[PDB]
Design a protein around this ligand. Sequence first.
Ligand SMILES: Cc1cc2nc3c(=O)[nH]c(=O)nc-3n(C[C@H](O)[C@H](O)[C@H](O)COP(=O)(O)OP(=O)(O)OC[C@H]3O[C@@H](n4cnc5c(N)ncnc54)[C@H](O)[C@@H]3O)c2cc1C
Ligand SMILES: Cc1cc2nc3c(=O)[nH]c(=O)nc-3n(C[C@H](O)[C@H](O)[C@H](O)COP(=O)(O)OP(=O)(O)OC[C@H]3O[C@@H](n4cnc5c(N)ncnc54)[C@H](O)[C@@H]3O)c2cc1C
Lengths: 340, 341
Amino acid sequence: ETIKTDVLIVGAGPCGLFAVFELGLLDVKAHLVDILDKVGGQCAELYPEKPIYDIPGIPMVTGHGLTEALMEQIKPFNPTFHLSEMVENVEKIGDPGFRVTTNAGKVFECTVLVVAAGGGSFLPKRPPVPGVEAYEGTSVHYAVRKMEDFRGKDILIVGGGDSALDWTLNLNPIAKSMTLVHRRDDFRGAPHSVEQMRQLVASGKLDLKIGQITELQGDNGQLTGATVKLNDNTTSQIKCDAMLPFFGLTMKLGPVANWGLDLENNLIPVDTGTFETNVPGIFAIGDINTYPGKLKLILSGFHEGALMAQKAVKYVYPDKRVVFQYTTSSTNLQKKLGVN
Amino acid sequence: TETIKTDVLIVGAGPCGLFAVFELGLLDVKAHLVDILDKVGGQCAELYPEKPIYDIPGIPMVTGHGLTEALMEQIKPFNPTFHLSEMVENVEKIGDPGFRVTTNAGKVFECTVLVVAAGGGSFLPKRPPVPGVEAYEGTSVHYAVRKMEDFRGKDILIVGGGDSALDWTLNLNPIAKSMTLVHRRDDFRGAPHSVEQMRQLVASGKLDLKIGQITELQGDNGQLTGATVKLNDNTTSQIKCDAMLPFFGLTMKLGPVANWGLDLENNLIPVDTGTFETNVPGIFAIGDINTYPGKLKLILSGFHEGALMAQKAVKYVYPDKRVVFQYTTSSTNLQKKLGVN
Ligand SMILES: Cc1cc2nc3c(=O)[nH]c(=O)nc-3n(C[C@H](O)[C@H](O)[C@H](O)COP(=O)(O)OP(=O)(O)OC[C@H]3O[C@@H](n4cnc5c(N)ncnc54)[C@H](O)[C@@H]3O)c2cc1C
Ligand SMILES: Cc1cc2nc3c(=O)[nH]c(=O)nc-3n(C[C@H](O)[C@H](O)[C@H](O)COP(=O)(O)OP(=O)(O)OC[C@H]3O[C@@H](n4cnc5c(N)ncnc54)[C@H](O)[C@@H]3O)c2cc1C
């Protein structure tokens, strides 16, 4: 059956997470969906280890620390997360009400939709090697679902983080041959992955080429080889049936484009009092939105979530009059927070 | 005498006034802050220092005092100048923009930009119900100390039972001719060191204590000579006093914000939602003093407001500065301003 919820939030970046808090203070429950395999969006994917200095009231917190703190704060409302899943279509079916379907065919029905999509859908980054589009699907792969597909062929893996290293090690001894290429001979993922890999190099079972891929060989989108340029300005050929780039993730607008929102420069325009869109029952908070003076700051997304929540309750509970209470002095609110 | 020149003058040192120092500082805009309270932090610090707050984004739980202390950390790298126990009384436009701003103690500021972060209003001494709406107020009923020489060898009536009342009894007792303290209950809830030095004064014959409420005052020409207290037995009793000092605590009134020609709406300053500027270019309003469609009296909104205000205020302070949006996390320029090395 379809999963029914008061609110569906697209994204579990900082601004999507905090929205759980503000919606929870008003007894509005939420499911969140993110194509990333972790909560925290950009903070968690792009700068987890790095210090942030402009979260009001925290002199310094890390990307990861912030993520972990927001998860604490929202833990008392019982949000339901669906990670590694992509929101694809939205269809208006109530006044308001929305049917929202994920890439794995999961279906939600919610009263209110909150777009917290941020910079966009995180997706595998395309490596910067001319003519790349063509081999995509056939012989350039950004994921391994069935590893049996790669037995006894020549594999080019490009990259040098955990995913690259995991796939090199797992796809040997399946492979006929393989050539790992990274820009530099320096690996994060240490110590265990990095050393098993260097064991494969030293044993002749893996060939390492330090550099970057400058062109590809193959007709009808089927690979046969690749040119690498090494760090001595020398080129060299590689034999490969398959190239698997692991250059990390990147953010593209994605499905937000296909939901009949009146975008402006790939941003959703929004009322400055309620952070609602053009479509009643659809809100947008965080870096996905726009309004005069908008700033892509975490702290703004917070404000935006708080004001959105005020509007979204009136759709979820229309007969109920909202009485403004403070978290510090209201025991009703403290009861919702699980403070005795 | 000489006017204090600054880029920005901030009215209030509540959470939202304090955070505005941060956002102005990321853009090399310096600030003076002025509050009539004797401490930073506004409501969080005066009304709920020891209470837990749960809706500061990213902090599961912080206290009124903890938040105040955390904000003072965050803004420390920019070197704000505070003027506490002082009140902003008048503002006058003198540039395009530019303001001359004078405090109740005749201090004068000249600033390019004014940021009203007045919150719930100025904190002020509450009237006791004597009726105390009084003849005596200019001259022998005082809500604050002038200089302490004013009270040498005077008979002093102090009414109240919190820290202030107790601080003034103890500080004025060595010089007073005589002193009576009156509070409605024989229970003192302020800091227990004060409470006990006070009871030392009672027990030593240096202080008269009377438990009850003042019902009547004695004196023509607005000059006190005594007072009637009703004790909790409906019994009355007479007190000799040249001066009555009520310390019933603080309360927030709109105050001087009403006298600056701003177009108010329900005692709130209307404001552009993109810049948090007012009707008067160069004057901004952030925090609980403001209004706009959707406004919520939340700390976290005042933060947003301060950030967007800063963006506009820099164009006045540095009109040839082209502003570039950078992140604290990734920009070494910003990290240089923060004193991260
Ligand atoms: C290097 C760097 C440093 C930064 N430093 C600062 C700083 O100091 N201060 C500051 O305030 N800000 C900073 N930012 C900005 C901050 O990262 C963003 O403001 C914040 O991430 C926005 O949060 P959000 O919740 O709106 O969305 P994001 O963090 O962008 O997360 C949105 C999530 O939505 C997902 N998504 C989008 N569409 C879909 C879909 N259809 N289905 C499923 N999932 C979807 C994405 O996978 C993503 O996880 C920085 C950004 C970067 C890159
Ligand atoms: C009991 C209680 C619980 C609360 N709980 C919460 C909560 O859980 N979460 C939340 O977000 N908010 C809460 N708030 C609200 C929060 O305290 C306010 O939104 C916040 O204090 C606004 O701060 P601000 O900087 O705008 O001004 P304030 O804290 O109002 O600071 C204003 C300061 O300005 C000064 N001032 C005004 N005019 C002048 C003048 N002319 N000259 C000099 N000084 C002047 C005042 O003396 C005061 O110190 C609570 C409030 C109360 C009373």
